[PDB]
Amino acid sequence: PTPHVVLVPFPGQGHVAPLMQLARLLHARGARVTFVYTQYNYRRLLRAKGEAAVRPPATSSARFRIEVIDDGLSLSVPQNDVGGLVDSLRKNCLHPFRALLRRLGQEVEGQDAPPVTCVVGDVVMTFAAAAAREAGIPEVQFFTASACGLLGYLHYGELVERGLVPFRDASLLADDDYLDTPLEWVPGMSHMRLRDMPTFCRTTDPDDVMVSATLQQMESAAGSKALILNTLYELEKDVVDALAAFFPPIYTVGPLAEVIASSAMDISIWQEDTRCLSWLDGKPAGSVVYVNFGSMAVMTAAQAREFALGLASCGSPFLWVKRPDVVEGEEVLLPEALLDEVARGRGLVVPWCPQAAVLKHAAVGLFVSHCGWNSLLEATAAGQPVLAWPCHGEQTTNCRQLCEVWGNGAQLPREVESGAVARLVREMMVGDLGKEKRAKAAEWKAAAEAAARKGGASWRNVERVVNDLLLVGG
Ligand SMILES: O=c1ccn([C@@H]2O[C@H](COP(=O)(O)OP(=O)(O)O)[C@@H](O)[C@H]2O)c(=O)[nH]1
């Protein structure tokens, strides 16, 4: 009997990517896969890339099905409106997904399809677990960010109990001294501060969507058959050991993409710029500052101007991925100093890039990052030190660990100012600060390679979760 796994990501590229990595692996191991897109995600992909690029090839098509479910969302909802996305999905997708499961069951007799044997839901997509449980189908959840981020979200309830959420004083939401307050009660992260908690706690609304949804997600995941985390156990040991008491068995599989690599579908609305890698070929080893802020976050025009002036004054060539909609508001031209550097060939601004390959390019010496988890996994595998500017969600938690525990990064202030940007980049490129972080980055690169090669800790967890849970139906 062919196992049949249904996978359900949240509609953001950092959630689709790890679940698609897993789906491709399961297909390689002989499973039937059904990959479930929301209509929001699917229609936005089709209008950007066309159906042919988004759907599977005819070679894999027999055992790789794409299905689309209703979500009630306008395609105009932007990726930075996380609460709007989360609220519609949790309210609107359950009954469409229940109907999809029924249809897949009818296809067993109708077309000799394999019965569904497991659902793998993104922790965010709690309806997937609810529907699987109703139907008597095992379900295993996949949290797509860091273990430290999960630990933060797990303690949102305790923030509420201690009166810290919602914020009773709106003036404290951005009070840097208040946000520095230590929270000494988080197991596995004794150095947690209020600002290090994932940022959605910073709300005065007692009915805030993201706090409510996080509580639902934690309760859902606690009831799953198992939990997949795309992280390196060695990197996050203290946090994972603290998480163990609150969840089903945890499998640390990170970096999953590297486990697969050791041993045909476009998931992005953006086109990766092919000129990046050849431009880097023309630059000396370790010389280039690479800047990228992921697929969801936005910044202000003033922040963008200060980053641009900081890059022009930092002393290094740079590759800046400036996503086309990253800046709130009307288009503002880049400063003359940066444009002249681009014209001289010393800098390059592109809309989107092949990120894993860019980070592994010998010319890159530093990653200025928003601290999105997939980006940090890509930097960790590449051995690139990180200068952090966390934006939302668990990016703050990641930044705290980068700085204080993992040791492969340093942080910029939230309020971007060109002079301080240039100075911190310079310290990271030629200073003792950068030497320390780059050396630690090299250690984590070796650790990630050991974990991902055959016999390593992440490799073993991939084999166990795949063979003992995901492919075992039949
Ligand atoms: O120029 C870029 C920047 C990002 N990414 C991909 O977009 C995702 C970003 O996910 P992450 O978790 O880092 O952050 P998020 O986008 O969720 O904030 C990852 O798969 C990256 O490899 C990409 O393909 N090209």
Author numbering: 9 to 271, 280 to 490
Excerpt from the publication:
Here, we report substrate‐bound crystal structures and rational engineering of substrate and stereo‐specificities of UGT85B1 from Sorghum bicolor involved in biosynthesis of the cyanogenic glucoside dhurrin. Finally, (S)‐p‐hydroxymandelonitrile is stabilized by glucosylation catalyzed by SbUGT85B1, resulting in the formation of dhurrin (Jones et al., 1999). UGTs are a superfamily of enzymes that use UDP‐activated sugar donors to transfer a sugar moiety to an acceptor molecule. The structures reveal the characteristic UDP‐glycosyltransferase GT‐B fold found in all known plant UGTs (Lairson et al., 2008) with two Rossman domains forming a narrow catalytic cleft, where the N‐terminal domain predominantly interacts with p‐hydroxymandelonitrile, while the C‐terminal domain predominantly interacts with UDP.
The UDP binding site is characterized by the presence of the highly conserved family‐defining Plant Secondary Product Glycosyltransferase (PSPG) motif (Osmani et al., 2009), and consists of residues W368, C369, Q371, H386, N390, S391, E394, and Q411, as well as residues Q21, E288, N308, S311, and V337. Coordination of S391 with the pyrophosphate group confirms a previous hypothesis of S391 to stabilize binding of UDP‐glucose (Thorsøe et al., 2005). In contrast, R201, also previously hypothesized to stabilize binding of UDP‐glucose (Thorsøe et al., 2005), is not in the active site, and is located 22 Å from UDP. The binding mode of UDP in the sugar donor active site is identical in the two structures, and thus not affected by the presence of p‐hydroxymandelonitrile in the sugar acceptor binding site. The two structures are highly similar (root mean square deviation [RMSD] = 0.17 Å over all 6148 atoms), thus not indicating significant structural changes upon binding of p‐hydroxymandelonitrile. Crystals were developed by the sitting drop method and the structure was solved via molecular replacement using MtUGT85H2 (Li et al., 2007). Finally, the high resolution of the UDP–sugar binding site may enable engineering of sugar donor preference for the production of new‐to‐nature compounds with tailored properties.
